[PDB]
Amino acid sequence: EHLIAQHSAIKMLHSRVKLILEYVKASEAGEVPFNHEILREAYALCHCLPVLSTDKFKTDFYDQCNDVGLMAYLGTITKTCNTMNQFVNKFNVLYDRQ
Amino acid sequence: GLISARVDSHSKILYARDVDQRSTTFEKSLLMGKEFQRRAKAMMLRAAVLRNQIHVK
Amino acid sequence: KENHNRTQQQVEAEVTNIKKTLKA
Amino acid sequence: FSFKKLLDQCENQELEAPGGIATPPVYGQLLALYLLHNDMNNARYLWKRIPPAIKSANSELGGIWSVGQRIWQRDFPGIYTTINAHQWSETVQPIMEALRDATRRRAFALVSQAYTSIIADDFAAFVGLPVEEAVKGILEQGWQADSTTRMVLPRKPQQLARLTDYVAFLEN
Amino acid sequence: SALEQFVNSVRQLSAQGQMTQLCELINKSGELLAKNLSHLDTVLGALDVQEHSLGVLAVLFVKFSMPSVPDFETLFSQVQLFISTCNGEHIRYATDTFAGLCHQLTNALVERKQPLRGIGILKQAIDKMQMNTNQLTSIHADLCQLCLLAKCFKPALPYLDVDMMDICKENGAYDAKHFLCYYYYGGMIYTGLKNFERALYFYEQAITTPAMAVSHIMLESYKKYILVSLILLGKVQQLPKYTSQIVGRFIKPLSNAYHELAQVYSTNNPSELRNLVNKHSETFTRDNNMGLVKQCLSSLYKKNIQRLTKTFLTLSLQDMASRVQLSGPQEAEKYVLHMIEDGEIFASINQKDGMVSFHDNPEKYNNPAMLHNIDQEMLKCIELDERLKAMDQEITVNPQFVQK
Numbered sequence: 001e002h003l004i005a006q007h008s009a010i011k012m013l014h015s016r017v018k019l020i021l022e023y024v025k026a027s028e029a030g031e032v033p034f035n036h037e038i039l040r041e042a043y044a045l046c047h048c049l050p051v052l053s054t055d056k057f058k059t060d061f062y063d064q065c066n067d068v069g070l071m072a073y074l075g076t077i078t079k080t081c082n083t084m085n086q087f088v089n090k091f092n093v094l095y096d097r098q
Numbered sequence: 099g100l101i102s103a104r105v106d107s108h109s110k111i112l113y114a115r116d117v118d119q120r121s122t123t124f125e126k127s128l129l130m131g132k133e134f135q136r137r138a139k140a141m142m143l144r145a146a147v148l149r150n151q152i153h154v155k
Numbered sequence: 156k157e158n159h160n161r162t163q164q165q166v167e168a169e170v171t172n173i174k175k176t177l178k179a
Numbered sequence: 180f181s182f183k184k185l186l187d188q189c190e191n192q193e194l195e196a197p198g199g200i201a202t203p204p205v206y207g208q209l210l211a212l213y214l215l216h217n218d219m220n221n222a223r224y225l226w227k228r229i230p231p232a233i234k235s236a237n238s239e240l241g242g243i244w245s246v247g248q249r250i251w252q253r254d255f256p257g258i259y260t261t262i263n264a265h266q267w268s269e270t271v272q273p274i275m276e277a278l279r280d281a282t283r284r285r286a287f288a289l290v291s292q293a294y295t296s297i298i299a300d301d302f303a304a305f306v307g308l309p310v311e312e313a314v315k316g317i318l319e320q321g322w323q324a325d326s327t328t329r330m331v332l333p334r335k336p337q338q339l340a341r342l343t344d345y346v347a348f349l350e351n
Numbered sequence: 352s353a354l355e356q357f358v359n360s361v362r363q364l365s366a367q368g369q370m371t372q373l374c375e376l377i378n379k380s381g382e383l384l385a386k387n388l389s390h391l392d393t394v395l396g397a398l399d400v401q402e403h404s405l406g407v408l409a410v411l412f413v414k415f416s417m418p419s420v421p422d423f424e425t426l427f428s429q430v431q432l433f434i435s436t437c438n439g440e441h442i443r444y445a446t447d448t449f450a451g452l453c454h455q456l457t458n459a460l461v462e463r464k465q466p467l468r469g470i471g472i473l474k475q476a477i478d479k480m481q482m483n484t485n486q487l488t489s490i491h492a493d494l495c496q497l498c499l500l501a502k503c504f505k506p507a508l509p510y511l512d513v514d515m516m517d518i519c520k521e522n523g524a525y526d527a528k529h530f531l532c533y534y535y536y537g538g539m540i541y542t543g544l545k546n547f548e549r550a551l552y553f554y555e556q557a558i559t560t561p562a563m564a565v566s567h568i569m570l571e572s573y574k575k576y577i578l579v580s581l582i583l584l585g586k587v588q589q590l591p592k593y594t595s596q597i598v599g600r601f602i603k604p605l606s607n608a609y610h611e612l613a614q615v616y617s618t619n620n621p622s623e624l625r626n627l628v629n630k631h632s633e634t635f636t637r638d639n640n641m642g643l644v645k646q647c648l649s650s651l652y653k654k655n656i657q658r659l660t661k662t663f664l665t666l667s668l669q670d671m672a673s674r675v676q677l678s679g680p681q682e683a684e685k686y687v688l689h690m691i692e693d694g695e696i697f698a699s700i701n702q703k704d705g706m707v708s709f710h711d712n713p714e715k716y717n718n719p720a721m722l723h724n725i726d727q728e729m730l731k732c733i734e735l736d737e738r739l740k741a742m743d744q745e746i747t748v749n750p751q752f753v754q755k
Contacts (some may be wrong), residue, residue, distance in 0.1 A: 009105075039117075060338060062718065062719060066716050066717065066725070068122070069726065069729075073728065073732075074127055075349070075733055076345070076348070076729060076736075077130070077134055077732065079736065080735065086743060087740075087743040089316075090143065090746045090752070091743075093755055094746055094749060094752040104664040105662060105663050106704055107663060107666050107667060113655045118436070120716065121696075121716060128472060128728065131732065136552065138589070138739075139691045140555070142514065145591070145742075147530065147560065149516045152518065153561045153563065154527045154531075154564055154597075155563060162744075166744050174753060196472065199467045199468050224503075224543065287690060291515055293691040293698075293699060295708070296703040330702075344733075
């Protein structure tokens with residue numbers, strides 16, 4: 001239910017970028033007239049593509065990843081403890097030593 | 099005691115030590131996971147020795 | 156999700172079969 | 180990768196023996212290889228495993244143990260002398276030629292990490308070569324050296340599948 | 352000879368079912384099973400060996416005297432090939448005489464003081480006899496014991512790195528002695544390799560075994576539990592609440608030199624603990640656990656240095672060798688250097704001023720290596736819970752469970 005929303009957003013972005021690339025290729029070939037301003041803006045769009053590849057961003061991203069990993073670990077432990085309680089309860093009434 | 103500091107015996111200066119909150123939680127959570135898994139394995143073997151009814155007679 | 160649901164329903168199906176047998 | 184292919188080849192030969200005792204050169208190779216991997220506990224137990232009769236028969240085995248005793252105490256200035264006290268034949272010689280380099284690099288890492296200032300006299304005994312490193316180290320590796328006081332200053336120089344595994348486990 | 356015709360009569364019974372009644376006549380002995388059959392025994396094993404060859408050997412090792420001629424070396428060679436090519440599932444139906452055969456072989460090798468040829472024998476027998484690698488058989492104790500007498504610890508590692516969850520009933524027998532032996536000889540093996548984290552775990556399991564009387568194999572596991580806990584941890588760990596009452600009432604009073612050692616190993620004073628070691632030295636050397644108390648001596652010095660990092664940031668070498676009683680700046684210099692290499696402390700030695708600076712800043716949790724480290728701990732717990740769920744489900748479908 002979440003990856004499908006992500007998929008739709010990415011597909012819309014992909015459609016827009018594909019249309020822009022098709023226009024750029026058509027301008028290169030000759031079907032559409034050479035529009036200098038549009039191609040300049042396409043160049044500016046391409047020059048911004050590596051969005052924020054700095055070291056501080058990488059450190060912050062790694063911090064976020066480790067925080068989510070720890071939050072997953074604490075809670076995987078909880079699910080395992082719940083299953084452990086369930087198994088102990090089911091085992092006690094069967095192998096009761098009375 | 100209540101003092102959280104580190105004595106520097108070279109220049110004779112008592113520096114105050116502040117713990118890092120993020121690293122402390124990671125150390126404790128990983129330690130708890132290691133202890134919990136050890137307890138789980140020991141209990142698992144205990145279940146086997148109880149079902150088999152093993153004792154020293 | 157489908158694998159876990161199938162196994163969950165498979166155990167529940169087996170326990171009820173042995174329960175009904177001895178109920179007169 | 181190529182070296183690892185030869186490591187496991189000698190391992191199993193000792194286990195299968197006609198009478199529980201293998202040929203002398205097989206025993207010597209395992210002891211020398213244990214030294215190269217720094218696995219001191221198994222090297223000590225291998226020496227205790229060899230029967231006393233064969234141990235006294237071949238003094239080549241004893242030469243390996245004398246070197247092993249020095250590295251067991253972490254005596255860096257002393258291991259370089261015991262490795263040359265005896266002469267090893269060409270059949271076992273290349274292994275010693277690699278243990279010496281491993282010890283040499285081990286001292287380099289230990290000094291750069293556990294020492295902020297070290298006397299040139301002590302550092303030379305650690306790395307093993309008090310021959311030409313005295314003048315070459317100043318200008319190449321950049322470590323500032325001060326004469327008279329003789330102090331060296333070491334200086335310091337796909338995921339999406341994993342995540343959906345966690346959720347598929349937690350939700351079920 | 353009616354025996355030769357009888358062998359062919361066994362063939363027509365086999366290969367067409369009737370496996371249950373075949374084992375029925377096996378337990379009926381057979382009056383030593385015609386032990387002098389060795390001349391025809393070579394041709395008896397038709398096809399790729401059968402189970403019958405395994406049955407006869409189990410009974411002629413228990414002659415109580417001179418088992419298999421001075422020709423044992425000849426017979427053991429055929430036994431080595433027998434295990435390596437027996438194959439099939441016929442052995443699993445008879446997991447009471449294969450283990451008995453292993454016990455007789457282990458006893459033989461011990462008396463002749465050759466505990467190295469049987470290491471390669473009790474390594475494929477376990478591999479196929481057990482249902483899965485997580486099932487504890489009665490041969491694990493023998494394999495660990497054999498590799499303990501003749502010191503080859505490495506081969507036994509794969510059978511000690513796996514968590515046992517089942518115990519083979521072995522068609523009866525299997526008393527608590529075999530269970531304690533595996534979790535005691537495993538403790539010695541890990542202790543020798545200086546793996547105190549898992550050695551302490553193994554000794555604890557033996558102690559927590561339910562019991563009603565003191566055993567010789569459990570007495571020397573409370574003693575080593577204290578010493579290993581003093582080396583790895585700073586003090587004696589607390590035993591589990593569900594331990595047998597025999598250890599709290601009977602085992603503890605005999606182990607009073609080790610308990611006194613723990614008492615001294617609570618206020619840091621190497622000089623006092625040195626006197627106790629040389630006073631009770633006769634006890635520590637009789638139990639053969641000598642060289643594990645001398646490590647407690649070294650661990651006291653290293654523990655005190657690990658405590659200096661909780662209060663100091665820069666300490667002179669001369670001053671450092673005055674609280675830990677090392678008696679010399681040169682001695683303290685090498686003690687710190689060894690601990691840094693092991694990883695037990697983070698410090699750097701400044702020889703110009705004769706000082707030691709305690710960094711105590713190992714790592715911040717912003718690494719991709721740490722992310723993989725947490726993930727590895729994740730997979731162990733996730734896969735451990737799956738096997739818990741699997742064993743829980745089999746309880747639900749148990750006919751006894753549904754009634755109550």
